[PDB]
Amino acid sequence: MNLKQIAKDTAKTLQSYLTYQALRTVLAQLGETNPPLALWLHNFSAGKVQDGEKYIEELFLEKPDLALRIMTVREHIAEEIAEFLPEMVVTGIQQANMEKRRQHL
Amino acid sequence: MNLKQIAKDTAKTLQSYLTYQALRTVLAQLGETNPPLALWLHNFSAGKVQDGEKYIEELFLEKPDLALRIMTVREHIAEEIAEFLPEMVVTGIQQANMEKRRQHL
Amino acid sequence: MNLKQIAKDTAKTLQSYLTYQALRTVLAQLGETNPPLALWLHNFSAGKVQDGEKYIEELFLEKPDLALRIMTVREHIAEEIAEFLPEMVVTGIQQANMEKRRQHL
Amino acid sequence: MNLKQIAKDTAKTLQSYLTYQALRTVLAQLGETNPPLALWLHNFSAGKVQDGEKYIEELFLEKPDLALRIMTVREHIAEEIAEFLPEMVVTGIQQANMEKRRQHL
Amino acid sequence: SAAGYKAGVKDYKLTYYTPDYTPKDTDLLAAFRFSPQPGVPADEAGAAIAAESSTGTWTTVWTDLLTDMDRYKGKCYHIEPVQGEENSYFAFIAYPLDLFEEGSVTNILTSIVGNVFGFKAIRSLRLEDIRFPVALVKTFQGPPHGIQVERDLLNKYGRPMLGCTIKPKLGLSAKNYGRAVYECLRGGLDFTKDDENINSQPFQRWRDRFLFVADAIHKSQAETGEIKGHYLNVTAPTCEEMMKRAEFAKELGMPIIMHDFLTAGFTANTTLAKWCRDNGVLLHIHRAMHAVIDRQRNHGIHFRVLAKCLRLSGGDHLHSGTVVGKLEGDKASTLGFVDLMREDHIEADRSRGVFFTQDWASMPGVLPVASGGIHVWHMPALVEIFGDDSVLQFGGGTLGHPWGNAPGATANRVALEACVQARNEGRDLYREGGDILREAGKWSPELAAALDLWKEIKFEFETMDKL
Amino acid sequence: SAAGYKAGVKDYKLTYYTPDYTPKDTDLLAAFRFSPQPGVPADEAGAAIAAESSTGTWTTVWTDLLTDMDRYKGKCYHIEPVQGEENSYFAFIAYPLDLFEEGSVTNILTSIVGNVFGFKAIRSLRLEDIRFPVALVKTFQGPPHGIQVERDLLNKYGRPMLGCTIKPKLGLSAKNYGRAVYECLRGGLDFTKDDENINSQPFQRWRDRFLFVADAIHKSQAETGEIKGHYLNVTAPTCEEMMKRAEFAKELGMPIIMHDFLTAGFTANTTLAKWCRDNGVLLHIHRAMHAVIDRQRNHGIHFRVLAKCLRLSGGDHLHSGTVVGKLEGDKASTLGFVDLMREDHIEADRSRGVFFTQDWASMPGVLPVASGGIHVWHMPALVEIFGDDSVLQFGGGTLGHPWGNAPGATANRVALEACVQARNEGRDLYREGGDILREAGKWSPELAAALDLWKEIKFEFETMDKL
Amino acid sequence: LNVTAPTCEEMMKRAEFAKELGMPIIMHDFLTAGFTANTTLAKWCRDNGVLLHIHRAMHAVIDRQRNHGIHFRVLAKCLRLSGGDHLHSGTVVGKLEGDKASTLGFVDLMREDHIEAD
């Protein structure tokens, strides 16, 4: 249980999930405000969201405007929700574990 | 930004990744302790790692004891690391963005 | 304009006005909850409120219960209002000054 | 705790004390600069220092220029020191209380 | 005896803080969450709340001694700090039965929340719950019909009912309104409804809408062989107009109308609920404006109090939130007040926000209505959360169906009937909802189109870590 | 043309954010203060507010193309950050005149504050101001009488009027109620009043109170030779009961009644205001429950919007706060909405919280009523702040007068007449109020006793710094 | 069906029977009956869903000569305010007088939402 490594890796996964979720937000925003650009972003993004930093850098070359938008949204999302994730993950695991023992064992 | 939906989705992704991390732990333990049982779990789990709660209920159907081993470990990791994740992801994102706004903008 | 000395002296005056105002609060509280003790406190306090620390120490010998009550109220008052006093005093002086020039000059 | 009344009352007491401080400044200045005018102001002001705004309107009736000198200085002091008063009074009170709760309680 | 009049200001807590008081079963109990101003002790703040919502004012008055203050005064009988939060407390206050006008939610609220929220000595105040004593509950009519009588009137059994708000909110003529209604209802929805702000306006006068909508209901009911309804909004400027509109709906033989109980008010609502009982018209209640009051947890009134008040005033449906849709709803809280509006006896349970055990003495339940920003992918969760005794409403989720209105309507009607069939067969809507929908999507192209459109962020991420 | 129907979710700001829009004089304008959720841009949040309070929903619907959306949609035409505050903005939104039912405050509120406060994407929302267009203002009756007609009916000129709430709030019998009223009125007060929560209760049924209070008014008016009134509370469970109570007050020849407009509601209030006009009865409005809505500046509706709405719905008096008393009231804000409820034309002035210039097209003003925790020492400040066209009310400040009720009443009556005389003589009530009171206290022992009791923390501290 | 009557009471009695018969439309002579009776009838028609045809009998006593009287376009505006679903506008070409340019003007005034000065 290499905790510094596990946390590091969990954090990078989190960072890159929040990037993906910032994407979903601006995609939805653009669906309302700029339908053709929403389509461009959707088609561009398909199969690119595994690594959030790699994704943003790819987006910088084509549309630095959108890259900066996603950067801001991921930052905002994290600032609003990050503090509530420890409880949600700990008590979620504990409840999920204990629901699996109740169904089977 | 449907924030409670995003948080809800984020926690379930953290729970699935921590289940994957626990599966990595249990696997490395059985590497010292029980090399056969390790080989069974490594081949059983390849590709199954998608949804952590579905993976657990499916591993319970085959080997209830080993599922319990992964259940304990996922939960142990979560209790140890989850409280550090907020500060890591928030400052992680801010630092990664700060880099790119510096070179580009 | 010995500013460290003026601030020091203004702070002590403030501290000792807030003590006096904590007194008024508990006096009023006691007027509702314990009329005879309100009377005792009022009669005890008459001509004692110039120095707030001297006052509290005199009160400790007779009624340590009440002393501790005032100590808490002055602390609470300060924590609620202190941050708004700089604006109120600066803009009050500036408006009072300028009202005096408008009436006369 | 009628907090806006207390704050309102506190600011007017700070304004009156800062007017007394300014009167002390102007007085010490005239000590170097104009010893007669100093002696007039020192005897004029003895006992008058009660309400700062009443004192000012009364000094304006006798000597509009000197009232203006006190007006400027009270305001100069306020702009320089007022921002430090919150932290001084809050930590002042907490420290003074902390002393007494230590010996007594 | 009358203990002598001594004029002057006393602490409220001398009279109104009664930590040794044990509430009677006829007492109305209230749970407040408050933060006192710095320097105001919690018990004095709690006592001030009890005082100024019952019998007391800021100074001692001699008139107290003409009556029996002990019999009448509000009693703050318990205070507890909110765990984990600085300067926040719960005060529990008991009010004698005698303080309240029978059958008047207006009067109850006037005491409990009339003046105390603006008290200088209190930073913030939020009413969390009220226990209505059974003796008071019995002075109210409650729902004109309630859940079981409504199912019996409409011949609707065995699954949630389905509704739909017509869109755009405002702007459609009466004829175009009825057009949209006909096409929705013919496709399988049980109900359509006026938007809450559709009353009577230059682009669409109310009496014209009532006329054209009645025609749409008849045509769609004739085609489908199922009872159809449309909540005609009678929300009006005055009581007289409200009644005039309710009356015409009855004249048209309309089964159901709607009312915005908060923006119109409890006095008008209670009038309407009584009329509905006497005239056999079902009453759908829209909670417009509630979030102005109930959203923030530091100040206001929690929705579960408003839900209780509405069940007393009278309503057959009441919007409950979705949890999953475009508007806010905490799940634990929602499960709590859904029980409060449906069941006869609800045990105290702080984990679901129910501070007091509530009995209803056989007052009918109110149908919860889940509405707002929901589409087909939400269906299994909605059925899971609310169960059969609910109305699920899809406005944009029907009229926004890529091929237009009629296919949009069919998508919703098919999705509903598939869920009702599955439920009746014993399938678990919560666990199997997505599958039931996918199944139906296989043979319904228009449902498939809708499922695709509103599916929604997926995630999906990755395996490397190879040996 | 109708630009093709493309189903699916779009950003609200594509349709509803219109920064180049210039509001028409017939537009209803609203100023909202909001904080978006992290990740939601301010212009999208502002557009969502405009959308879901006018014509829009969460997904694209084909029915838009049946009408002219440009004519009907709400338009967020300006957004500005709140200076000095993180993640807080003002959105200014224009709504076409066509969206609103004439003469209906209920409908206006249903649109503007109906659903948007609970939107997930928004953390908090507070409506700060509404500009009511003159064309809409003219569809309302407004005050049954208003300030100048009221002074003329009551023969009351030249100073503030004086009132008094009877205490204890609840618990007194009808006969003891009239007793307290008679003694108050005979002593020099113009009005007494029911407490807001005095409606009809076991200890005191309404019709008995009306009877005994009418007797008290006649006796005191006969003794003093001045017109007396008592605001009889007609606030009731239903419209029918409300009207029944208003009717008996008229039958008794009572000049004035009161109504809790928020706990009863705007629909019942508008009914009552029309009746009052037709029957020549003055209408005092109590704002019970307003602080549930208007206290916190991050979420809710500011009182100045509620004051505007009440002037439209109808009321002759409306409580305005005291600034100095037991309940909260910001002075700058108060001066602002006192102008909004009295004057015919009020210029925008953000320093007093007036976001929009408001015209009233000669709709009568409403008398502000200062009430709550005030006593004689407050008098010069109250006269200074509110001026002559106000009612100042002393409940505890009359009935709490050390020697009992009759001397308490005389203290208030003397204090009032001394102030009116002084004002009429040209004395400045603000600067000289304390002195005027001290003067009168010299020859009135009972006033002196009251001045002493409620004088109140003085400070007073010290001179050392000797040479 | 013409509900034009000697009194308000008779007018309403006749309007009421038309509604009872399920008749979609009635008529009223707004000038010979008067605006007070007409405004009463227009409100009733709204509340009872009956269309209101307005006959302009007597208008030419008032509006024919251009030196004295009130032009019809004012009467048309007044009628739209008082209430009517139809209003006679003239023919231009028939047996009674109607200036074409004028007619095109007040037809716009009675139909449209915004009419520029011309």
From Swiss-Prot, chains A, B, C, D:
Keywords: Bacterial microcompartment, Carbon dioxide fixation, Carboxysome, Chaperone, Cytoplasm, Photosynthesis. Signal peptide: none annotated. GO terms for cellular component: carboxysome; cytoplasm. The keyword Chaperone applies. GO terms for biological process: carbon fixation; photosynthesis; ribulose bisphosphate carboxylase complex assembly. One of its GO terms (molecular function) is protein homodimerization activity. Induction: Transcribed in light but much less in the dark in both normal air and 1% CO(2); the nitrogen source has no effect on transcription. Constitutively expressed when grown on fructose. Part of the rbcL-rbcX-rbcS operon. Its main location: other. It is found in: Carboxysome; Cytoplasm. Homodimer. Interacts with the exposed C-terminal peptide of RbcL ('Glu-459-Asp-468'); binds 1 RbcL peptide per homodimer. Contacts a second RbcL monomer via its peripheral polar surface. A slightly longer RbcL peptide binds to RbcX2 with a higher affinity. Belongs to the RbcX family. An RbcL-specific chaperone. The central cleft of the RbcX homodimer (RbcX2) binds the C-terminus of an RbcL monomer, stabilizing the C-terminus and probably preventing its reassociation with chaperonin GroEL-ES. At the same time the peripheral region of RbcX2 binds a second RbcL monomer, bridging the RbcL homodimers in the correct orientation. The RbcX2(2)-bound RbcL dimers then assemble into the RbcL8 core (RbcL8-(RbcX2)8). RbcS binding triggers the release of RbcX2. The homodimer has 2 functional domains, a central cleft essential for production of soluble RbcL in which the RbcL peptide binds, and a polar surface which plays a role in correct RbcL subunit arrangement. This is RuBisCO chaperone RbcX. It comes from Anabaena sp. (strain CA / ATCC 33047). The chain holds residues 1 to 105 of 135 of the full protein.
UniProtKB/Swiss-Prot annotation, chain G:
The active site is at residue 55. Keywords: Bacterial microcompartment, Calvin cycle, Carbon dioxide fixation, Carboxysome, Disulfide bond, Lyase, Magnesium, Metal-binding, Monooxygenase, Oxidoreductase, Photorespiration, Photosynthesis. One of its GO terms (biological process) is photorespiration. One of its GO terms (cellular component) is carboxysome. It is found in: Carboxysome. Substrate binds at residues 56, 88. GO terms for molecular function: magnesium ion binding; monooxygenase activity; ribulose-bisphosphate carboxylase activity. It comes from the Bacteria. The disulfide bond which can form in the large chain dimeric partners within the hexadecamer appears to be associated with oxidative stress and protein turnover. The record marks 95 as: Transition state stabilizer. Binding of RbcS probably induces a conformation change that displaces RbcX2 and triggers the final mature conformation. Heterohexadecamer of 8 large chains and 8 small chains; disulfide-linked. The disulfide link is formed within the large subunit homodimers. The exposed C-terminus binds in a cleft in the RbcX2 (shown with endogenous and Anabaena strain CA protein). RbcX2 is displaced by RbcS; as RbcX2 is removed RbcS mediates the ordering of an internal RbcL loop (Thr-64-Leu-70) in a catalytically active conformation. RuBisCO folding and assembly commences when the nascent large subunit folds with the help of the chaperonin GroEL-GroES. Monomers require chaperone RbcX2 to assemble into RbcL8 octamers yielding RbcL8-(RbcX2)8. RbcX2 is displaced by RbcS; as RbcX2 is removed RbcS mediates the ordering of an internal RbcL loop (Thr-64-Leu-70) in a catalytically active conformation. The basic functional RuBisCO is composed of a large chain homodimer in a 'head-to-tail' conformation. In form I RuBisCO this homodimer is arranged in a barrel-like tetramer with the small subunits forming a tetrameric 'cap' on each end of the 'barrel'. Belongs to the RuBisCO large chain family. Type I subfamily. RuBisCO catalyzes two reactions: the carboxylation of D-ribulose 1,5-bisphosphate, the primary event in carbon dioxide fixation, as well as the oxidative fragmentation of the pentose substrate in the photorespiration process. Both reactions occur simultaneously and in competition at the same active site. This is Ribulose bisphosphate carboxylase large chain. It comes from Synechococcus sp. (strain ATCC 27144 / PCC 6301 / SAUG 1402/1). The gene is cbbL. The chain holds residues 237 to 354 of 472 of the full protein.
